[PDB]
Ligand binder design. Structure first.
Ligand code: DXL
Ligand code: MG
Ligand code: MG
Ligand code: MG
Ligand code: MG
Lengths: 386, 386
């Protein structure tokens, strides 16, 4: 058996050309950042992970190295299940908060343990998880068309992503619902019925404006309505779902652990659970959430948006899961999606395949890592919701 | 009008002699720690606060100075309501997590803004809040008799607090329910019916063991059963409450914002909301939670346990609130209760009075602060629940 010797958190920042910054309810993007988690062992088998973002990099680094890390040093990394609970009950729930950046931190470490396990076994993570369900590949969507566009421009951008091979894409909404509606109408007219259009309000709407928008989304045949409301308003989501439209009510990037999703399910408040393996507790926790969605006859389609590691970690699980595929793929300017690792976007008939190597299944460019150390740059401007 | 110039977070640690270290489901106490928040203005009016604990001090310091702080610099501190929302929607909810150490961090800053406001106005916080309801003083309880005692020892400790003037005290339970039961029985026999006995399991029990223990709490006429279960199991709390006993089901030190408590209320799952002004969002947020409890014909009795600032902040609110008083007073070894400030425990006929000075109502001993800089010591050993 191996023993964990170090838990490291590398803070990384990559720039965004001013014109390529995009804004949603989450704020105006400034620099694409991440923590690259590195778990080392006595025999030199290493796993890597990411706790997603945007979350302050110093907060993440401290939580990972100095709160979670000490619970892992000296432990057999093979006992991922034991270690999840040791960390959650020993430190994170009480001492970082039960639905928190500490849970995202745990997630990054958990992903690294799964990567380590796959590397030790010389198997891709999806093989450990029972192998593929989606044997031919996983249907992806282009994430996302952001604010600050006219309707013709939104339609142009959608048509562009479709030309690149995407069969689905997402639109950010929430600031100016009349403009959002005009954008959606133009988008649908441009591409026709065979392209799925998803909408994401980043918690920007109140209940009544969300009900008004849902009518529009229904008219436009939208696939889902993501974060239509504050994630704190469970009943509001039930109200939207109770309208009985074919538009799925989706949320989950900002909800943590299976406990959050259980509360939504018990209140008939969710169609699509979007728990991200890199945020909601780890691969370990996302597995449980995906299963719980299926038990309730609901869907799990994770949020994946931060870096190529968060994408890859979720993709292993999605490939292995019988849930209908609607796999988030960040198409915005992001060096962490292109230059961090050897795994790249490749669409065939609208589908992507999980990485095929051991663990997460690709190689990290450590020269790139060394050249992009964080120097205190901000990731994102102030969010909305006031 | 003033302008905020600096938001500082002083990391402090104070030791606990070996024999004085107590253990509960939250862990074995090692050092009593805090962040002392200091908000400065251009005209030299300063407010202080605390975001409670245990939470990692470096995580807190970074969140306060470098995540929350930048949203405050240059702002008029008088607009506490505006600033709460600027911070929550701008940064904390999404970028630190909606039920998180970030919320505790916000709470410390919010308390400091209220302290600053009171100092600027030359009024105690309770006067701003509409003045006293509890004009004669606030009934307190001794917090707490911890694990590791025999029944005779538990009864003697309780009798000791009664001799000191307390009309109520709390017992920690959950590791060995048969011993817990024996302790309670001995305690009740010793003091008779006129002393309130509270019980706190620190999330240690599952549903069936909690139902079994509730029968014994009922037999012993206990006032409340605090954190009987994981705070993530709302339905389990409903089950306990549905037994219809005179024992109140209490939770809240580990639940964040009014949203958590609304979910408990909507599920008929809570009798006593324990939202702490220094954890759950601030004085601003605790005010709303207290009001919401009253609207639902339930009680708000805050958790207050970390330092004299968290005690004082809650006491101003409790003094002003019509809720029946059951005010938590940390009687364990804690230099942050005795040496940080000029305000101390003064029990008269079982009651305490809020500080009478401006703002929080006492002065900080800055020499003590300077002499107790954190040097990386841990606050608490691994918690339980696994
Ligand atoms: O000592 C402990 O068990 C905790 O740190 C406290 O917060 C406790 O739950 C309480 O109600 O004051
Ligand atoms: Mg567990
Ligand atoms: Mg989203
Ligand atoms: Mg608000
Ligand atoms: Mg407690």
């Amino acid at each position: 058996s191996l023993k964990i010797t170090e838990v490291k958190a590398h803070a990384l920042s990559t720039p965004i050309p001013e014109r390529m910054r995009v804004e949603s309810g989450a704020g105006l993007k400034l620099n694409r950042q991440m923590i690259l988690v590195e778990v080392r062992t006595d025999e030199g088998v290493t796993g890597v992970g990411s706790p997603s973002g945007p979350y302050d990099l110093a907060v993440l680094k401290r939580a990972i190295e100095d709160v979670i890390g000490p619970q892992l040093i000296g432990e057999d990394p093979a006992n991922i299940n034991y270690l999840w609970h040791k960390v959650f009950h020993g430190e994170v729930s009480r001492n970082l908060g039960h639905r928190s950046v500490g849970i995202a931190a745990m997630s990054g470490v958990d992903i690294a343990l799964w990567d380590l396990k796959g590397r030790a076994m010389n198997q891709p993570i999806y093989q450990l998880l029972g192998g593929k369900f989606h044997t031919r590949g996983v249907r992806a969507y282009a994430s996302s068309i952001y604010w600050d566009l006219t309707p013709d421009q939104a339609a142009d951008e959608l048509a562009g992503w479709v030309e690149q091979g995407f069969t689905a894409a997402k639109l950010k909404v929430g600031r100016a619902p009349r403009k959002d509606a005009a954008n959606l109408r133009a988008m649908r007219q441009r591409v026709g019925a065979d392209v799925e259009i998803l909408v994401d309000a980043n918690q920007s709407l109140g209940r009544h404006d969300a009900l008004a928008m849902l009518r529009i989304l229904d008219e436009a045949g939208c696939y889902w309505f993501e974060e239509p409301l504050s994630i704190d308003d469970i009943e509001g989501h039930r109200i939207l779902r109770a309208q009985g439209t074919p538009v799925r009510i989706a949320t989950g990037e900002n909800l943590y652990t299976r406990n959050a999703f259980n509360d939504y399910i018990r209140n008939d408040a969710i169609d699509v659970l979007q728990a991200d393996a890199s945020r909601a507790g780890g691969i370990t926790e996302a597995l449980a959430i995906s299963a719980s969605a299926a038990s309730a006859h609901l869907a799990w389609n994770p949020h994946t948006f931060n870096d190529i590691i968060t994408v890859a970690a979720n993709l292993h699980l999605v490939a292995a899961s019988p849930h209908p595929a609607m796999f988030e793929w960040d198409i915005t300017h992001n060096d962490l999606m292109t230059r961090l690792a050897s795994y790249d976007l490749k669409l065939e008939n609208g589908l992507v395949q999980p990485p095929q190597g051991p663990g997460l299944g690709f190689e990290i460019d450590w020269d790139f890592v060394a050249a992009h150390a964080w120097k205190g740059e901000p990731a994102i401007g102030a969010g909305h919701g006031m």
